[PDB]
Paper text:
Here, we present the cryo-electron microscopy structure of the prototypical archaic Csu pilus that mediates biofilm formation of Acinetobacter baumannii—a notorious multidrug-resistant nosocomial pathogen. The structure of the Csu pilus rod was determined to an overall resolution of 3.4 Å. The Csu pilus is a thin (around 23 Å) left-handed filament with a helical rise (z) of 28.0 Å and rotation between subunits (φ) of −153°. Pilins are tilted around 60° relative to the helical axis and about 69° relative to each other, resulting in a zigzag appearance of pili when viewed in sideways projection. In contrast to their classical counterparts, the subunits in Csu rods are linked together not by one, but by two binding mechanisms. First, the incoming CsuA/BN+1 pilin subunit inserts its donor strand GdN+1 into the hydrophobic groove of the preceding CsuA/BN subunit. In the pilus, CsuA/BN+1 not only provides GdN+1 to CsuA/BN, but also inserts its A′–A′′ hairpin into a pocket in CsuA/BN between β-strands B and E2 and loop D–D′. Moreover, the GdN+2 of the third subunit CsuA/BN+2 that complements CsuA/BN+1 binds through its protruding N-terminal part to β-strands A′′ and B in CsuA/BN. Finally, residues in β-strand A and loop A–A′ in CsuA/BN+1 form several contacts with residues in the A′′–B loop at the bottom of CsuA/BN, thereby bridging the two main binding sites to form a continuous binding surface of 600 Å2 with 41 interacting residues and 13 hydrogen bonds. Thus, the clinch contact confers pilus rigidity and determines the trajectory of subunit movement during clinch formation or pilus stretching.
Residue numbers in the entry:
A (entry chain D): 1 to 14
B (entry chain C), C (entry chain B): 1 to 155
D (entry chain A): 15 to 155
Write the structure that this text describes.
């Protein structure tokens, strides 16, 4: 069991 | 005072390992799903692929067995359990989803073991394809939207 | 001959109860922290969550009071008091730790009451997130490694 | 001889500690479980011996005020059956009036784990109030 993290991103600007 | 027991276990024998990750303190950092920049209302489906934090390409799981091993992949629902990115300052949310195939059809259903195969001496990539629905309604507030999906390579 | 007294007490009135446990004989069996299979030397932090023995998900503590009750959670150091899993046959040990938050930051310090809140008519889950450091040094011997952490839901 | 630490002299009777199960409702489904807290320091009873060679001392606990290990409500006559075990997994029971063996080395504190355990009460709701008992622990040689 290898659980990790996946950072999700979105820059709502222009 | 209700005291109970929690049995801890680990089978050190011939397991499978996940490459492409970096150890962020005590939690594996698998990668980033960077949709990029966008305006308030986007008509096109915003779409980006996971970038492994260690090498910049896809997560490359390899197994240590000689025979083909069938390992599973499960992704959770994010910080709020409904796959929504949240603005760092305001309370605006941006609904998204992660799919397994390049055509956004085979969805990584929340807390589900999407099956996978791996041969001896190879790197089977784990495609985590992100996808966001068109936002032709309200313009979400300016700023940075984030989420931390926990990917669970389990056997 | 030194005989003394041990006062026994129990306040039956409006207490708090812990769900997700099974009564193993005369000791509550709260769950299992299953890291899974692994090889001698693992480069990725091995990480798994507690699975309640009664329902397979997280331990779901509920209180019987109408007002919010603030209950605490304390986990001990395991069989050898230093959080090490021991091989069933050999004397090899595998150091580990249990954290409270999904990002492996808020550690359940040994014999410490990590605070918790619970509202009337709800199941507040007790996340016991396990984490093991990368073993890029010596390959620990083959077999099964175990430990029995005693979780202490106390008020 | 050998001496028992962690106790306080309550008048003329050693006060070894408290087995505090905590608060609970009428009917509890989970086994209520708590450890003895020494009255002097708040942790376990720490027996030490004064000999240079290892001494083998015994520990015996009796059946409580009513000799059947039942806590009694201070006001009503309701009873709550319980038991004290020696190991953390509630298996090695401190049988009534029995010398459960123990070892102690020179210059160390061998703790006496008195692990309490109460069976699930999924039948009748016992009346509200405080239930008590006074187990007499007998460190004898």
């Amino acid at each position: 069991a290898v659980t990790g993290q996946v950072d999700v991103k979105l820059n709502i600007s222009t």
